[PDB]
Amino acid sequence: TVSQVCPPPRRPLTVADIRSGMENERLGVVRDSMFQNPLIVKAELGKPRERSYSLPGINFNYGLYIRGLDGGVPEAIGRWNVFKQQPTCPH
Amino acid sequence: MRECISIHVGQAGVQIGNACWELYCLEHGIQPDGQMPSDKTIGGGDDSFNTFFSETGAGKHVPRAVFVDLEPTVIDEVRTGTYRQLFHPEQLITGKEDAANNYARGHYTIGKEIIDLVLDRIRKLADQCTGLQGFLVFHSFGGGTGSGFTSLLMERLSVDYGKKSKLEFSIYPAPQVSTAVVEPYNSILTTHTTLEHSDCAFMVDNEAIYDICRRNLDIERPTYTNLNRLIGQIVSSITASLRFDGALNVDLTEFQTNLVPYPRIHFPLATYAPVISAEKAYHEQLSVAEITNACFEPANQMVKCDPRHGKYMACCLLYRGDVVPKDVNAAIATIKTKRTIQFVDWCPTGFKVGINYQPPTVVPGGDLAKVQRAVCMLSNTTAIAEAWARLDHKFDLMYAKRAFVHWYVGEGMEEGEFSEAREDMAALEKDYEEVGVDS
Amino acid sequence: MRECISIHVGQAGVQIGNACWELYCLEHGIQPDGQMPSDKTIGGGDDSFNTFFSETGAGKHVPRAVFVDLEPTVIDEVRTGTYRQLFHPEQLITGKEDAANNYARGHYTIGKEIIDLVLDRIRKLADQCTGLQGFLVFHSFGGGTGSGFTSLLMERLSVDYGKKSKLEFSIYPAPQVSTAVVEPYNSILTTHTTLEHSDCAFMVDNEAIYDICRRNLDIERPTYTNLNRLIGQIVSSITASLRFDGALNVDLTEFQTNLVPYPRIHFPLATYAPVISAEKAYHEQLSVAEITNACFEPANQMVKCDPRHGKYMACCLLYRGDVVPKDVNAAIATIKTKRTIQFVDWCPTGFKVGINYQPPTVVPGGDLAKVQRAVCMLSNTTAIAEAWARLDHKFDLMYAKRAFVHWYVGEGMEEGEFSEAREDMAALEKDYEEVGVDS
Amino acid sequence: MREIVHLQAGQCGNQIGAKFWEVISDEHGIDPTGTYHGDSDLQLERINVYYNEATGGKYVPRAVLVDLEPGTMDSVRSGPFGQIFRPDNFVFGQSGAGNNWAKGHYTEGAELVDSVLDVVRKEAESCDCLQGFQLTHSLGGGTGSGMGTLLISKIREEYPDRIMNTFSVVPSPKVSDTVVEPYNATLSVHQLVENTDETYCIDNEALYDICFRTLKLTTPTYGDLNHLVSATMSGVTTCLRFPGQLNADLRKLAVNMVPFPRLHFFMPGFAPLTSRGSQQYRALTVPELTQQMFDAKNMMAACDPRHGRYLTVAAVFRGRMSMKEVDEQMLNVQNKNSSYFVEWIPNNVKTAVCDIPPRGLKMSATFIGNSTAIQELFKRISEQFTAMFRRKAFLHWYTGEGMDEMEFTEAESNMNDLVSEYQQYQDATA
């Protein structure tokens, strides 16, 4: 997670992040595990559910992308891959 | 040279236009100042902005849109905010008093005062066009300005402009929730006019987008800002074949032919996939077959209607990003095999595909995740007849005791037009019965 | 390539499933964070995780599992603990109210509201499966959710998925110790739908694990964590033919035919050997010819029934570790020469073997030791004639005075279903009588 | 000495022609700038077939690229080999056809073909002795088929005795990518029956199946599909440019292939295609190449030859080889497949041999088959057309612009007549 899109992985909510007027602002004993836990934290206006763990960077595009290792039909037609035997070092 | 004019009318037409023009500025790399970034190389091969923006000799871009409304309390928020210097001062036209949920005030009394002023901008905007492709009109059926002033603007526009394909992006009233009492009145009086003067008309409602934002984007408490960014992705996906090159390009006139089989049926449904949050995109494997199957699901439909009741006439699929052309055609032939998805028997060839190269763009820190592939589906179904048989039940039940009538006839329309508009809509649902039957 | 989907239903399903997936991740090398670890072998080209883990381009693996339960107290333990990274957020389905040990609540009232959601998850996980072999459903005969919900889970699964194999891993009600009072009612109604919706259903009860853990493991106070560790070793022994290569490969459809002689008799018995304490092994090392005798010992049987009372139908033995095929041949010929072990006269080919190469693995904090070779036995005996003989005597003693009936008939089902399911089991006990006699 | 004028219409035709010009510029040794970078004199021996000289020894292609939408023109011009074409050969409209045959043939096809015929005439009287015209298009669209068949008609009226060769991408059953596809297919076939000397049918199902099962690629790009098309397209006309033992040009193939004035639709093929990892397990020998030629997996039209009888077969071999390995192999295959060749034409097969192989490869072949199995494709088009036309779907977009409702029935009758001719000649004895 840290390595993928290394620029700052998106980190979960902490005590220093919370500002005045936020819906997650609480009174009493305050830690970070409470804001990380799903059943204590509340949703905010016009924002999704808090992450509860670390996600990759802002410019990371999710999903499985397959990069072809072939050369295509120029390599399929433009040459005939004749086998080339390797000479050995003379023992 | 191909390029479009977007006309935003009504309150909800303006507020969608804030989210649509925010997306087009970020997609083409245009600042809210209206200029390309200064820390830029000379580059070259940049003509994608001609569809939506017009180059000034000093280096500025002016959007090709007219923000028109009959009240000044929603346009003054645009003349003061961040984009206050992107727009022309005359492209933001304000009225003096609002329509107040009346079709009569939006059509006869008040809306006649400014239509000479509104259409003068459109002729000025169209005169700059080397080749014009069509129009796009954003409005809402339940409102006064979105129903009244949109009717006379489209009637006057069809006379002057002969055969330019004009589009509608309408917020149809929801089956269960409603923010007005006179909503069935203004929706019936709109659909009588728009069958004659609209080449195509897309349908969304606010209740179906509420269920999407809860189960997919994981938003417990949505906001109208969050809905207008979902609608703005579809408009940026439909037009994306015009701006950026692709393997299979579909212009605006190309999917007029491929979605309208009869002249009185031009009501498709909009569906965009994938829409997921960042928490779920990190786990899922978003292949081409997964995003194609996500449009046929009944939960992903953006209109509260069940597609299992009716049959699909024709479908239009517009892929984006790095989608190989084979995985499109392998996914479609799986859909045709399944017996739950039903097609009419007079349209065996039901799918049209179009591939673009530029991947979708999102807003940083927003709700949607960053994915390099997507699909937008415009499917024509006979299931929309249930969405109108419900509305006419609300109109018939309300009109039997003659309620809310003296506000309409007190401005100039006659009582006979209420029964004339209803008698046309009874003929429209008979048109769906005569096409749904099998030979 | 070859792979299966595992569905965990009820509290007995989820708590067993926690022990299984901590075993599988360590066996394949995947961290609890969900990623392959650092300093890994470059260019390994391993596809052994493909059976139970789905690759994603970000480097993560997501299990092919669904956790289903009706109350949030057991699922929120997984969402909060150290395995919250590995699972998909939507693979963990959570209800609102529990069935309160009613088959009527888990089949008619509570289970009908989330069954539309659970089967939708099964389709999206089977969509990725290019080749699927079967399903793994974890349940118990005691509780209502393991009785009601599992009954119509596999009812709809058999209709939609035609000939795919389905294995039930059920916790049989122990003959003497039990928790519930209406537990004899649930098991009669549980199996009424199992005789004609299940391809196979394996049989392990709670009490026989207690005597094995007390004597073989020298554990004076076994815990429900320790019981599920023995269950996970048997299930990982069955699936070890899919993930790892061996001398003899036994597919999931292989012993599905080879253990079921008639469409009504599909209840095999599991037995593991050797299951020893950590301290004993270092001084002494085992052999193939001695671990075969440990399977047939009634003390080491995992079911509280006496195999000497009945006769064997067929046996399916699975050998894992440093096992040669010659020593298996010598061990079986030793068994058939003995007089205590008896086979029916119409099954001369009484056995079936399976050899694999990768030995069983250990976990940090576990109770078992590192054993070079181990054997898991699946047997089909007539010794379970006494097993349902006494639960039928527990059913009628409850039902003679009609006690605990008014709760079940108040939630939807009628009175005749108890008598209809009763005579089905009076026919099944006679079926062992007509089969076990020598012709 | 014999000149072929190339013609591109529509998006599919434009891309296929661009890839074909890339392929033959590679074969003749022409850099993308336009100069000559070659290694032999045999490349400049016969170069006036496709290229016109300029000042300073720069060779420009003899092709006309026409479309109703300038986006494809910009896409072709900003490509790898896009700087060799004459800018006066790019003819574009301002309004798109919109996948409409009426828009392609009557409304927007009226004003462009004046300029198109002016350009193609100015190229046509610049040759010494014109061999004929080549046009690449797709029958499933509005510009490729609509304006394409009008160009067929006007060129056939202007030049009565020439060779007219068309490479048409016919529609497919399961890769149907348009809903007005049967309409456009029938309306284009009705004109292509009587106005074209040779038509070669290319199918995307066959192209995808070749890219999947034979070559085993992972990302079958449209560039790769156009390369497959261009290989056959440049292998058909190789005896007009490279000397060989047995020469056979376009008129030779036409005379030796089409028996009756309506049966001029062919199924193409290519013969040395194998995957990258199975190259070294196989030897480039004439028997292996002939077996791979007559194999049914290399046909570029999705019609099984096992469902019909072959009328005529032509094959153009390339590469230095013997002649017994050609003649004996073809005699053996004709004697062994007794039940699949017709009995009223003895010696169903024709061979030609060329001495210059494709670059980087020792031997090659191009297969052209005339068969009675293309009636399957025509039948599956006709039944779709009937199913749409009975309920009259999608017809207001055609009839609001000046097309009557009798033309559809006349075209359907003509295509059913063609299918009846195929069935008549298939079921015929002594």
Add this chain to the structure above:
Amino acid sequence: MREIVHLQAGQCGNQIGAKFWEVISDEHGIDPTGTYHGDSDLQLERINVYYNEATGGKYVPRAVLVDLEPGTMDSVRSGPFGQIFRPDNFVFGQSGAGNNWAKGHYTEGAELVDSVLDVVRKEAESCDCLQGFQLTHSLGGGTGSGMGTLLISKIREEYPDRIMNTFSVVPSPKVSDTVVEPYNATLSVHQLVENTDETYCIDNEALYDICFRTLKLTTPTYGDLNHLVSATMSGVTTCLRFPGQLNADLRKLAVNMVPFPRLHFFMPGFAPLTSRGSQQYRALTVPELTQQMFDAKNMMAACDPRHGRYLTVAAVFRGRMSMKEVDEQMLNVQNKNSSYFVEWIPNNVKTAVCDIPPRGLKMSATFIGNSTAIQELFKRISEQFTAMFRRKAFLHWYTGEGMDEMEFTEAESNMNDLVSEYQQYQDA
């Protein structure tokens, strides 16, 4: 000149064929890379029998490998000699058969054998003058037996006058590893009586007994068992590839062995097989090799030769030796064993000699017995078959797939007819 096309069916057949291809690769001197690295120029004289020449001087085998599960193909392709095969000759399914003859014949085999015949026709038509086909299989499984009989039927009805060899690992009494094994064996022999030129019976009982007694391995691995099978497979067909003083190829043995058109099940046997321990002290002869050949404990089948009369005997020798010491030994062993040979066929023993032995051995043997001792094997199969069939055990899986009840009785009638024919020709 005279070619044999090899076909591996099932997991057991695939492993047997892979071991065979390794064995003859070391016999003809081919490295796993693909080229030729040998010493004698006589190895390249007859190499077209099993190998195809490519460009650059590579040789690829004429083998096709078929099954329904891709795991066996992956395991073979990742093996030691797994890079020599063509990459298009692997055709595999995606679902298992589950030891179901009905699945391997009716439901699942109907999709794959089209492609299998598509490959086999290309290999058989690329040759010059095809001799015939080899197919390796076992008579206990649905993947092996059913698909093998269907493939044999298709190839036989396509090529009417050829030679067909099936090397079958026949099920054994006490090494039962499948509960539907008698059902599969009877249903497969029902087709192998009427559709196969030669069938060779291999018994796991005799394999284990030989490996325990005369090789003395502590661990008789399946690799060594397939090595001992591959010795016999390479020894049968050495007259095609190597010159000899007396020649006897496939049809030479086929005409000479089979007296009546329903008796083609042979018991193989190999003679210079010795314990791993003492190479240095001694050298072989012909009487010693004949004694170890005709020893009943060295038979590769679980049928005692002394419980019946030999119909015909074949002996193929390898090395440099005279022929009086062969004919005299055949004569005196037949004179010694008066009762064990039939009365109405004098000179029951046929011999052949090839010049080149297998590598590392001065002299080598090969024994083929056609005797009346296989009637007890078919009797013990039939008793288990009818014991299961009387109560209809394990039958619903087979009969729910579209195959009736009377076909088992037809197979049982065929088996009873065959075991009556054995007694009829034993006592005369």
